[PDB]
Amino acid sequence: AVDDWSTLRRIAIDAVSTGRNPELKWLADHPEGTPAYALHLADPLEGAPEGLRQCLREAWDEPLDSYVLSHHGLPELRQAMERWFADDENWPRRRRLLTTATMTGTGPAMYDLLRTIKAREPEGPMAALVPRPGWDYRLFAHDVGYEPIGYHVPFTSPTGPEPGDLDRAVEQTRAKGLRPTVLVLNPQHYATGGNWTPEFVRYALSLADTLGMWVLVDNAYHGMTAAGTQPTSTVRLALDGGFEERLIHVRTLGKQFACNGWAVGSVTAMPDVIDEFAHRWYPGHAREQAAFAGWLNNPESRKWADERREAIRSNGDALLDALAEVSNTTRHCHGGSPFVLFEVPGGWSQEDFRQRLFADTGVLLASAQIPYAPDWVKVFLGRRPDRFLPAVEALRTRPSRAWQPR
Amino acid sequence: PELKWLADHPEGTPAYALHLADPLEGAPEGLRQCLREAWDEPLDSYVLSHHGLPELRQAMERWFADDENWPRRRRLLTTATMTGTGPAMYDLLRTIKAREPEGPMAALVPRPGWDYRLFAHDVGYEPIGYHVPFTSPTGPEPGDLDRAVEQTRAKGLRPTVLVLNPQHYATGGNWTPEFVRYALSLADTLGMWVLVDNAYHGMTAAGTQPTSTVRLALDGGFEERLIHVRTLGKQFACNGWAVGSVTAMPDVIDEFAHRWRGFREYPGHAREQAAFAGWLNNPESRKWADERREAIRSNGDALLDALAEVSNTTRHCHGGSPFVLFEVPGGWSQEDFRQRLFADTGVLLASAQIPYAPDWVKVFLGRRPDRFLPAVEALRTRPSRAWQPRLEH
């Protein structure tokens, strides 16, 4: 019965404009004293696991407020992070890649990695091959001086692009007179729920090697596939295939541990690359770095992550059942990243639909943002069940004409 | 180089690292208490407002407007910064570029000064330095700005941005109202944006009145292209927290927040921001800041006294930003001097980095007296030949 309104008010309401996104106006107009549930972002508002917050609390009296004098972050965090991800992703022990810590988000990290690659490569016309739909890679690419070229990602298939989808992007890059310079992969895919095939990832890695392209793999959701799913590990496939020199792995700790605002993540690449990245393109936030190191070295973190994969599975099942009671549109729950997709009832468009649904039920859902299929909705599943299931209940019990085709 | 010396330092003797603008202290206890007490609140998520956490944006706007004596009525809007005022100035420079016609642009920056030239070059401005005299406690004169404008004109560049830093990193200067007024009126005539960095505004030695650029600007009507930037880090002994503020006209902040910052960074660090709002909204934060200006004054006096005891060179303590400057004895480069001094005394100092005066040292004063004064005593009681001239006429 516990909702999100008090927290949404604290983080989204202000006396000046809070942003251009429509949902911020809906929140500003939301009736005070009535429930509101936020399922539109991969961002659990109930907060981080207690074990992590306890690490932060217990160090309040330690001198952790200054600059951090290693540009790569605290060694204790670098080590605990590389350990946790290498185990999670079954990295081989025989590797030359080194791991550096990032403290202001992996968005900024991939922006500066695109600049790092650009600095290492001969000046010329540069394409970044990015998944479409996908996360925000195209925005960083454009601002750094690459033309972003989308490769098709089907949302109706649990298994992601086929090799021919990549080939078509390479062909369009050549037709535009550009060199294919970096390929972004995101096999636990934001935000279709896909878990791309080892077949396609191996194809992508071999094609990149043939073309001399860099491969940037974003593994934000690798550890958050629904229980019973086997996530494809790009680093394992790449190193076993002998593609290492131009591999860059990026992964936020925030999506993994319900703490997006902590902004701690990791970048793993060849030594010369992480050296240029960290020095050319002092850090801070030692309190977050010290707290994460203690948490990741605690076996409770692995237990909590395992339990969360089971919650993602059961949460999706519960949402699917509710959607079946209130609606008759197509639904997907592919299990590869923690999102459910469903089609907007006929005669509605997705924005009007979500606005009306939020007014009638208090449940705020997100546009799926699929460019070739705009009128689909996406629902994030990576929340504690005691905070996700009340939102499902509101959908199942509060009537709305949003569900009825026009 | 300095970090290397620190590593070869013998274990068993005190080392005092005074070469950074960082006290290597815990942040004020009240601030850390605010962080600790909120450990069980749900503050781990992204912030959904593109200005940062509302309670912090509001508290820091109020605290700075009081500290800097801003007029109560103004159209400027204040946003929070969550990744450093360096990235913020990078994004502000890009916001300005997007609003001006294309063509070659100069950014006028203080020389010596902070690293504004690095951001300006990166975004595609040519950085043009204006002379900042370090011997005067009041900094540049109007003709120093006029010279940079004429250099800009001779290179066929449009002067597009002027960066002002009146509590100056890192000379100690406190620039005069007359100079800042001249700079604002000249920028307005030329259509230049004024970016004022006020990192050290609240950090002047007690008894020194910092010049408030925003007050002078708004009194004179120079609002439309004014941008204020100010970190909380240097003042409140918490460089690692990367919380600060930017204030500009509403349309400028919106583009900065939505497009230039907003297409790269997602707002976060709600824990730091809530802790700062609790601190700034506590009367103890103002009391602590006042007590800190007294500590900066007494620290600088104590260093000057110790220098008079062990040395016979020119020294400055201008009182406008928390730095003491002094000249190395004859026959010493600044690097050899600081390396010898650190070896003999355990006290590590910084180069002043004055390009027209290389062999000078600077000393940051913003640290607790019970931690600064032991370093001063080390300089007095540990003999060093660094203080003796190595030249003879």
Author numbering:
A (entry chain D): 6 to 286, 292 to 416
B (entry chain A): 27 to 419
What text appears in the publication on this structure?
Although the residues lining the active-site cavity are in comparable positions, Asn205, Phe236, Leu83′ and Pro302′ in LmbF are uniquely substituted with Tyr195, Tyr226, Tyr72′ and Tyr292′ in CcbF, respectively. In CcbF, His76 interacts with the amide of the substrate, and Trp140 and Asp141 form a hydrogen-bond network with the carboxylate of the cysteine moiety, maintaining an ~90° dihedral ψ angle between the Cα–COO− bond and the pyridine ring of PLP. The PPL moiety of 4 is flexible and located at the entrance of the active site, which is consistent with the substrate tolerance of CcbF. These differences in the binding modes of the cysteine moiety would allow CcbF to catalyse decarboxylation as the first step in the enzyme reaction. As a result, the LmbF-like conformation is thought to be a non-reactive binding mode in CcbF. These in silico analyses suggest that the active-site Trp140 and the Tyr72′, Tyr195, Tyr226 and Tyr292′ residues in CcbF play important roles in substrate binding and selectivity in the first step of the enzyme reaction. The LmbF-like conformation is not stable in CcbF due to interactions between the carboxylate of 4 and Tyr72′, Tyr195 and Tyr226, as well as the steric hindrance among the octose and Tyr72′ and Tyr292′. Interactions of the carboxylate with Trp140 align the Cα–COO− bond parallel to the p orbital of the pyridine ring, enabling decarboxylation to form the quinonoid intermediate. Afterwards, due to the absence of a proton donor residue, the quinonoid intermediate donates an electron to an oxygen molecule to generate the semiquinone radical and superoxide. Interestingly, although CcbF has four tyrosine residues in the active site, the Cα of the quinonoid intermediate is isolated from these tyrosines to prevent its protonation. Tyr195 in CcbF is crucial for the selectivity of the first reaction step through steric effects with the Cα-carboxylate, and the Y195G variant favours decarboxylation-coupled oxidative amidation to produce 9. Furthermore, the CcbF Y72L/Y195G/Y226F and Y72L/Y195G/Y292A variants, containing the mutation of Tyr72′ (Leu83′ in LmbF), catalyse oxygen-independent β-elimination.
The biosynthesis of the lincosamide antibiotics lincomycin A and celesticetin involves the pyridoxal-5′-phosphate (PLP)-dependent enzymes LmbF and CcbF, which are responsible for bifurcation of the biosynthetic pathways. Despite recognizing the same S-glycosyl-l-cysteine structure of the substrates, LmbF catalyses thiol formation through β-elimination, whereas CcbF produces S-acetaldehyde through decarboxylation-coupled oxidative deamination. To understand the molecular basis for the differences between LmbF and CcbF, we solved the X-ray crystal structures of LmbF and CcbF with PLP at resolutions of 1.7 Å and 1.8 Å, respectively. In the active sites of LmbF and CcbF, the PLP is covalently bound to the catalytic Lys270 and Lys260 residues, respectively, to form internal aldimines.
